[PDB]
Amino acid sequence: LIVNVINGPNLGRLGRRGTTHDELVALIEREAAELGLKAVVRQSDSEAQLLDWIHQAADAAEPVILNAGGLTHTSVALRDACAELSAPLIEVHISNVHAREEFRRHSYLSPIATGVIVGLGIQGYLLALRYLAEHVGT
Amino acid sequence: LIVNVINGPNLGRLGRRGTTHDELVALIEREAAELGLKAVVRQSDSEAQLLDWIHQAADAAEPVILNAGGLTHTSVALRDACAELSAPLIEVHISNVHAREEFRRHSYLSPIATGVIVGLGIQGYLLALRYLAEHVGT
Amino acid sequence: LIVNVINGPNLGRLGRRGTTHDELVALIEREAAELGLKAVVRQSDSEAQLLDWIHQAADAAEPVILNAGGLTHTSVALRDACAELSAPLIEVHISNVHAREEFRRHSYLSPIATGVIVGLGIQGYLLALRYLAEHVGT
Amino acid sequence: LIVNVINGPNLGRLGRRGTTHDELVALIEREAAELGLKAVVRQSDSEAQLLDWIHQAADAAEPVILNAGGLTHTSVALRDACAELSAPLIEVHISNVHAREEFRRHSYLSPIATGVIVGLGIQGYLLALRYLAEHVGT
Amino acid sequence: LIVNVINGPNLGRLGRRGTTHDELVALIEREAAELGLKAVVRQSDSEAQLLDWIHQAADAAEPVILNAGGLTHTSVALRDACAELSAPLIEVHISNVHAREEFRRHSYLSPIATGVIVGLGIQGYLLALRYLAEHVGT
Amino acid sequence: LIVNVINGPNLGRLGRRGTTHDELVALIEREAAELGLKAVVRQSDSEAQLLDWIHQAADAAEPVILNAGGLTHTSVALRDACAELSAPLIEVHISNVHAREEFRRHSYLSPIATGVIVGLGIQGYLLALRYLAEHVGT
Amino acid sequence: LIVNVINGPNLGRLGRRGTTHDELVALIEREAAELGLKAVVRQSDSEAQLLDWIHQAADAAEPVILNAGGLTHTSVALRDACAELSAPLIEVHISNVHAREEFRRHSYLSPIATGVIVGLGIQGYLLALRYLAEHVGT
Amino acid sequence: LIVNVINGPNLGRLGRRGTTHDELVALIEREAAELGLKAVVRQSDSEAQLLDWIHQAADAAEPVILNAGGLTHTSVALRDACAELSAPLIEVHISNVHAREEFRRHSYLSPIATGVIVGLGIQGYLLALRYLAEHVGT
Amino acid sequence: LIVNVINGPNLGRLGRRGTTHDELVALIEREAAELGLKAVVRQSDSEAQLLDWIHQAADAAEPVILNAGGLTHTSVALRDACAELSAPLIEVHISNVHAREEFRRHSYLSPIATGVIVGLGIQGYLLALRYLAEHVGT
Amino acid sequence: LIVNVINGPNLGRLGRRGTTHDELVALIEREAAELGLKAVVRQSDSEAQLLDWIHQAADAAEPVILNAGGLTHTSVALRDACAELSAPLIEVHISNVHAREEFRRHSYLSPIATGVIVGLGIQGYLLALRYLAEHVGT
Amino acid sequence: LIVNVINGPNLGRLGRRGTTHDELVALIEREAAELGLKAVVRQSDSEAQLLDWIHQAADAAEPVILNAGGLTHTSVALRDACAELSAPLIEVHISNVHAREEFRRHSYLSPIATGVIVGLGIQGYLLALRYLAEHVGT
Amino acid sequence: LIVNVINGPNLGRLGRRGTTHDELVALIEREAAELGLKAVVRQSDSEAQLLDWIHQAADAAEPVILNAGGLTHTSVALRDACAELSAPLIEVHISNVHAREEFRRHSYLSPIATGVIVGLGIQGYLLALRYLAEHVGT
């Protein structure tokens, strides 16, 4: 039912870094409604704020779709907060992080996530939602 | 319209390594029909045979969804055949290859692929199909 | 006399990640009183806030007992703030950080700390207090 | 005309870590006036706040002189915000970061910066200003 | 009740390498009595002799406080003997082994030990005793 | 008063590798006069000749501004000659050596230099002169 | 009862690369009969064919003695097929693979095998058979 | 007299990956006739087939000119087959394999080959033929 | 005729670390008699004692079967003593040392040994004896 | 028409390090005449002199065949001079530099060269000439 | 006056591993007498015994000439004992340890020794004695 | 009889970098006369000049004592010239090159030299002479 979509540093800049972050929210919220879900979309440049949203999902046992931006590669604290989630965690990157700098090919999140989607654009979010909708059966 | 789904070594063993490879074919072909696509699903344990199917997709300019199994980590020849594709190439792994041995966290295919889906089970294939259906607009 | 105990990201979650962070505060404050000390215990998920508490200890020349959580492994800025302390700095980890992932076996703090205690549970804090009480003689 | 000088974690402590951060501001603002520029000097220990000031410079197409302190070595998110700048970005370190610990000899910022000045003291800032003044001709 | 304190190569030289090894024994034995324990303190420069004392602790299921000196960094055989202990094993270093040569920052013992204390001087031994006294409850 | 500017291999080719090496000399000598200095500018493709000019600066206790070209990355002998200088040594690169090949991001000179300027064009030389002029006070 | 002996690339060349591959088959089949076993010996230069023989042993729950030749060092796909075996897998090399090139000292098979024999010549096969005969008791 | 030219995976695609593989055969066979040689040109995407052609050259003691494509970088089995050749082995790459990805700069074949030609286009084959013609004297 | 079986540190603990070291001796001595050999079995936790037994085998030109325990991974001195043996040296490990910690996958002994057996239990010793019995012909 | 053949350190010693450097010059000059070219052959042990000959080829836009001897592996300055050539640059080694020490398998020149010939003896020079003659058509 | 010459594991085997260890003692003792010194020569295969002889030299402030055999490369404990010497410590190897295996090119002793002699045979000892005789002046 | 002592870059600066290079020559020439030798001492900052002196020693089959200064660590060309010497080559460093920067602990010369002396001051030269005098017997 409730799915949390959390975006990390710089993702507020989408469209100027053409879909904007507001349009992304709209797209996600339409998809989720079609799927029978309710998406809660949040973005912050602040690690502490991302931690607090992860903590809340942990306490509520709600899935998470996380695009942690550069913190993917660098934050053990984020990793550790994510390891507490009991529900599914799907890591998303809009670009293909394996076609860029070598340092972007290591993620602290992937090993603890249920799965990862990269390179498929903003549609990656939508596809993550669909996994979570079809992974509510038994 | 036509999408090629190619499975590499050991993927014929699905279900005993519970969905079998035949059931996977059936699932993919139903999804593709719903999406308005036609999926051609092939599996081989032979690198040379996988190369030939990639070559054919290159000549036809048809997208590919590739689960290369262990060859993901080891074959430069497969990589090189894939670099010739002009249409989208989506790399899929059923399990989360970042939660296993360290050697599975390097892929020769990811850098040249449009994107990658891992850890989402057999549904990863279906989600790759949906990207390709929504990425036929302009 | 005054000792600062500072806890970093995720340590507010103790007990659910059975002793809670409030119980830890209580335990530390009882020990410190028995030892003739006054413990000031603070926790934050925010690097900037941890920096400010370190800066204050530097200006006051008061010892610090620091459990920096994941920032131990990743923050040069925290390290650098800690290098300004003139009083003792004791690094504490509740779990044995050498029995986990390889990345947890490198600390930016250990080289600049007076000493380090790991693996001894919440009692590590209490033992750090006792060092500081017996290291006030000449 | 407008140049942004942004200082990262611990730089507020200058003089006690003998020129203070206020004196640095004064020195920069006098130099800039002599050069015909207007310097806006900001300092924060908070990554999110540094990101926001970088974002603003990106939107305004104004140059930046950045001393990111320890975040130089560790933040991909800062790097990524900086990659959006269209105007010049000059990385400054007061000390010679190549004469210290080995870990300080890798910067995530240098590859994306116009240039870098290290080891020349607070005068590094002033010299960065002069580059920007003479790099306004055609 | 019985705790074994075992010191490895060069620790017989304490005080001239100002507390001597005899004074250390005395200090440990007074602390242990205060705690209600009985400490058995042994030192040898001989790996085979250290192995035999570890084997005996294994057979008796008695805790160990071990300062293995240079063998910490180099002996797989010592590690392997220690892995047989069922009771707690606390690794102690008098100096901060992370503030010295890089090679001293890897220990074969830490991963298999209950916990580790470094940098706190001879008081590290005493603090290890206190852990073991308070870790005899249920 | 006297400052030595020494250029290493290939720097004689400036402008064709648009400012030529003669124009650089002229620019440096005008700046230096404005600053009250006297610049002596030399260029050679010969390591032995660069060594001899460094030796002379060492004997005279005169500062050096050095652009060692490729020898920056490869010559321990140059490094060692430079370590004898008692006056300031400022390393200069016209391009940003951190935005190119990985091998150019290690310099044998930086650790022993007072500071380093890279990426600021030929103006880097001029800025190095200004440091040296303002670093003649007490 | 049935044991599979599978030889990989180049092993058909034994004797000319003095025992030939046919003589090896004969030697193995005589030993196995003496032991009360039935050995099925197969050799191929084709990875896909080796995979198929491993798959068959997996389905039948029969032990395997495998000399994978160069594929030992390079094939993740072979490894993965072997991980499905429930019966014992004994890796054999005729020469001592640790006395040659460094690259031959890493095997993808050893970690998943029951055990490994190297350097003992063709007798290694025979000794592997004897393990399997004495490892059929309870 | 007889020289074998063997091409590995993907080389059948020459011209579309403008000279085609058939034209290459024609060019090689004309050159060889001019030189007094007889060239036998073979191409396969199958490692096992390449092995068999190498084995045949070994048994006949005929030289080989080998373009192993991606298998250059990855196959120990190919290497090992090649080590059996008594006649000259010349490794050829049409492109400069040192101007591409880092992984292409290591070859398992070069150390065992007589020599290597890269970057000289299809003419590399022809030049390899000429070496072999002039290396038939005493 | 005479074969030396030497066991290193911790191997005296077999059965409690269910076959004991005495039972191993008995098993080896029965096998050897069946084979027409005489086995001399020795175990020590002391490197110097192992060295002396290796030296004696060197002087007598008698084969050795060596299980050096942790010293396999760490002792150059043991290696060097073993390099003097003229008769066969067979390295044995009871467990599969490639299925454990990464550090156990490097042996100083393997490169100088005739061959190695790992993972086959105590039967590895017996199989080593059989090699030595069948390797006494011409 | 004009091709420059430049030989680096130690190549003057050919024949005693049986063809001498004078005979090499003669062989090259005969080949070049047969091909319709004019070869200018130079050798020096001095990096600065090699640089000057490269600079001259750059200014004249003439091809170069370069055997830089040990400087291949070590000189960034030589590399950088070579990067200025607009005409073809063919790297030659007489021996197979991949069959020797590991350090000889990295070249600073190969990535910037048109192609490389190694292991083919002095005939490598002659083959490089032939490439350049047939690469003068359109 | 008194110089200690200490030999480590395997050095008792000199001559059979043609000068024997007794002849070495004789040679050293004749040289030392000629120089006006008194040499005390000791050899052991036991680390603990070598430690005790180093400890004694430390307490007496007598120089040491040490050939630690394989322990050079592996013992931190030996290193640490040696760091206590106040008089000169000269490391000797009879063979050139840089012309052998790569692992022999790292010594734990060299960094703490006054100097090192390798490759000069048994005469290395004699030359070490001569240094110590001429290094007794002021 | 004739021994060549060759000094590389910066060694002309001895005494100011208290024995000067002229005094070193005098000391060497007195020692050599006492030993019955004739020493020829040369120093240059020029690699090409050092090469020429090595070449001459090669042609004459005369020993060499070489202090190559920084070129020890960096020149493959020097190494290669030295490999041609048939007479002994003794590498000398005045300081202990293993007690300084890590990069000084790798020498291109040591593996090809007869032996090496470091850390023994200018007396190292004299001791090298004595080896060569006593290594003229049979």
From Swiss-Prot, chains A, B, C, D, E, F, G, H, I, J, K, L:
Q: Which family does it belong to?
A: Belongs to the type-II 3-dehydroquinase family.
One GO biological process this protein is involved in is: amino acid biosynthetic process
Q: Which GO molecular function terms does the record list?
A: 3-dehydroquinate dehydratase activity
Site note Transition state stabilizer applies to 17
Q: What does it do?
A: Catalyzes a trans-dehydration via an enolate intermediate.
Keywords of this entry: Amino-acid biosynthesis, Aromatic amino acid biosynthesis, Lyase
What does the annotation say about its assembly with partners? Homododecamer.
Q: Which Gene3D superfamilies match?
A: Dehydroquinase, class II
Q: Which residues form the active site?
A: 93
PROSITE patterns from the UniProt entry: DEHYDROQUINASE_II
Record lineage? Bacteria, Bacillati, Actinomycetota, Actinomycetes, Mycobacteriales
Give yes or no: UniProt keyword Ribonucleoprotein. no
- For this protein, the Enzyme Commission number is 4.2.1.10
Catalyzed reactions: 3-dehydroquinate = 3-dehydroshikimate + H2O
| Other known facts | Was identified as a high-confidence drug target.
What is this protein's name?
A: 3-dehydroquinate dehydratase
Any one GO CC term of the record: cytosol
- Tell me the residue numbers annotated for binding substrate: 67, 73, 80, 94-95, 104
Its pathway, per UniProt, is: Metabolic intermediate biosynthesis; chorismate biosynthesis; chorismate from D-erythrose 4-phosphate and phosphoenolpyruvate: step 3/7
